[PDB]
Amino acid sequence: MIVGQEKPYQNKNAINNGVRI
Amino acid sequence: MIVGQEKPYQNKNAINNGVRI
Amino acid sequence: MIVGQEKPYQNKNAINNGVRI
Amino acid sequence: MIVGQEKPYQNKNAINNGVRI
Amino acid sequence: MIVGQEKPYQNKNAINNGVRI
Amino acid sequence: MIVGQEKPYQNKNAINNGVRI
Amino acid sequence: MIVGQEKPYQNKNAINNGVRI
Amino acid sequence: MIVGQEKPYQNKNAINNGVRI
Amino acid sequence: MIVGQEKPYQNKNAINNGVRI
Amino acid sequence: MIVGQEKPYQNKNAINNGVRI
């Protein structure tokens, strides 16, 4: 039973490489 | 039973490479 | 039973490479 | 039973490489 | 039963490599 | 002159949410 | 002259949320 | 002249939230 | 001249939240 | 001239929150 995630709730995964204003 | 995710709820996965204003 | 996701609800997956204003 | 995460709630994972203003 | 995390709640994991203003 | 990216070369942007074997 | 990235070369940006074997 | 990154070369930005084997 | 990074070379930025084997 | 980093070379920035074997 190999499983990644169970009920991830609003996990904000961001990889910001540019510009945010 | 190999499974990635169970009920991911509003997980904001963003890879920002440009410009956001 | 190899399965990717079960009931993903409004997961906003965005790969922004350009400009958003 | 190899599993990554159980109910991660609003975990803000950010890799900021550019500019945020 | 090898598992990474159980109910991580709002863990702000940030790798800041650029500029934040 | 607001521009997102100039000559992005083979940038592999992947958002893996399921199973890859 | 607001710009995100200049010549990003093979930047592997991955947000792994499931299972990779 | 607000700019995020100049010639990022093979920067491996990974946000691993699940299982990798 | 506000800029995040200049020629980042193979910077391995990882946020491991699950299981790696 | 506000700038984050100049030629970061193979800086391994890791935030390990789970299990690594």
Coordinates of all heavy atoms in Angstrom, one line a residue, chain A:
Chain A
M1 N 0.8 -1.2 0.0 CA 0.0 0.0 0.0 C 0.9 1.3 0.0 O 1.0 1.9 1.0 CB -0.9 0.0 1.2 CG -2.1 1.0 1.1 SD -1.9 2.4 2.2 CE -3.5 3.2 1.9
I2 N 1.5 1.6 -1.1 CA 2.4 2.7 -1.3 C 1.6 3.9 -1.8 O 1.0 3.8 -2.9 CB 3.5 2.4 -2.3 CG1 4.3 1.1 -1.8 CG2 4.5 3.5 -2.4 CD1 5.3 0.7 -2.8
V3 N 1.5 4.9 -1.0 CA 0.6 6.1 -1.3 C 1.3 7.4 -1.0 O 2.0 7.5 0.0 CB -0.7 5.9 -0.6 CG1 -0.5 5.6 0.9 CG2 -1.6 7.1 -0.8
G4 N 1.1 8.4 -1.8 CA 1.8 9.7 -1.6 C 1.2 10.5 -0.5 O 1.8 10.8 0.5
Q5 N -0.1 11.0 -0.7 CA -0.7 11.8 0.3 C -2.2 11.5 0.5 O -2.8 11.0 -0.5 CB -0.6 13.3 -0.1 CG 0.8 13.8 0.0 CD 0.9 15.3 -0.4 OE1 1.2 16.2 0.5 NE2 0.6 15.6 -1.6
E6 N -2.7 11.7 1.7 CA -4.1 11.4 2.1 C -4.7 12.8 2.5 O -4.2 13.3 3.5 CB -4.1 10.4 3.2 CG -3.8 9.0 2.8 CD -4.7 7.9 3.2 OE1 -4.9 7.8 4.4 OE2 -5.3 7.3 2.3
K7 N -5.7 13.2 1.8 CA -6.4 14.5 2.1 C -5.5 15.7 2.3 O -5.5 16.3 3.4 CB -7.4 14.3 3.2 CG -8.2 13.0 3.2 CD -9.0 12.8 4.4 CE -9.8 11.5 4.4 NZ -8.8 10.4 4.2
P8 N -4.6 16.0 1.4 CA -3.9 17.3 1.5 C -4.8 18.5 1.3 O -5.5 18.5 0.3 CB -2.8 17.2 0.4 CG -3.3 16.2 -0.6 CD -4.1 15.3 0.2
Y9 N -4.9 19.3 2.3 CA -5.9 20.4 2.3 C -5.2 21.8 2.1 O -4.6 22.3 3.0 CB -6.7 20.4 3.6 CG -7.9 21.3 3.7 CD1 -9.2 20.7 3.5 CD2 -7.8 22.6 3.9 CE1 -10.3 21.6 3.5 CE2 -8.9 23.4 4.0 CZ -10.1 22.9 3.8 OH -11.2 23.7 3.8
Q10 N -5.4 22.3 0.9 CA -5.0 23.7 0.6 C -3.5 23.9 0.9 O -3.1 24.9 1.4 CB -5.8 24.7 1.4 CG -7.3 24.8 1.1 CD -8.0 25.9 1.8 OE1 -7.4 26.6 2.6 NE2 -9.3 26.0 1.5
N11 N -2.7 22.9 0.5 CA -1.2 23.0 0.6 C -0.8 23.9 -0.5 O -0.8 23.4 -1.7 CB -0.6 21.6 0.6 CG -1.0 20.8 1.8 OD1 -0.6 21.1 2.9 ND2 -1.8 19.7 1.5
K12 N -0.3 25.1 -0.2 CA 0.2 26.0 -1.3 C 1.6 25.7 -1.6 O 2.5 26.2 -0.8 CB 0.0 27.4 -0.8 CG -1.5 27.7 -0.3 CD -1.6 29.1 0.4 CE -1.3 30.2 -0.6 NZ -1.5 31.5 0.1
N13 N 1.9 25.0 -2.6 CA 3.2 24.6 -3.0 C 3.6 25.5 -4.2 O 3.0 25.4 -5.3 CB 3.3 23.2 -3.4 CG 2.8 22.2 -2.4 OD1 3.3 22.1 -1.3 ND2 1.7 21.5 -2.7
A14 N 4.5 26.5 -4.0 CA 4.9 27.5 -5.0 C 6.4 27.4 -5.2 O 7.1 27.4 -4.3 CB 4.4 28.9 -4.6
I15 N 6.7 27.4 -6.5 CA 8.1 27.5 -6.9 C 8.2 28.8 -7.7 O 8.0 28.8 -8.9 CB 8.7 26.3 -7.7 CG1 8.5 25.0 -6.9 CG2 10.1 26.5 -8.1 CD1 9.1 23.8 -7.5
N16 N 8.5 29.9 -7.0 CA 8.6 31.2 -7.7 C 10.0 31.5 -8.2 O 10.9 31.5 -7.4 CB 8.1 32.4 -6.7 CG 6.9 32.0 -6.0 OD1 5.8 32.0 -6.6 ND2 6.9 31.8 -4.7
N17 N 10.1 31.5 -9.6 CA 11.4 31.8 -10.2 C 11.4 33.1 -10.9 O 12.5 33.5 -11.3 CB 11.6 30.7 -11.2 CG 11.9 29.3 -10.6 OD1 12.5 29.2 -9.6 ND2 11.4 28.3 -11.3
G18 N 10.3 33.9 -11.0 CA 10.3 35.1 -11.7 C 10.0 36.3 -10.8 O 10.6 36.4 -9.7
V19 N 9.1 37.2 -11.2 CA 8.8 38.4 -10.5 C 7.3 38.4 -10.1 O 6.5 38.0 -10.9 CB 9.1 39.7 -11.3 CG1 8.7 40.9 -10.6 CG2 10.6 39.7 -11.7
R20 N 7.0 38.7 -8.9 CA 5.7 38.9 -8.4 C 5.6 40.2 -7.8 O 6.4 40.6 -6.9 CB 5.3 37.8 -7.4 CG 3.9 37.9 -6.9 CD 3.3 36.6 -6.5 NE 1.9 36.7 -6.0 CZ 1.5 36.7 -4.7 NH1 2.4 36.5 -3.8 NH2 0.2 36.9 -4.4
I21 N 4.6 41.0 -8.2 CA 4.4 42.4 -7.7 C 3.0 42.6 -7.2 O 2.7 43.0 -6.1 CB 4.8 43.5 -8.7 CG1 6.2 43.2 -9.2 CG2 4.6 44.8 -8.1 CD1 6.7 44.3 -10.1

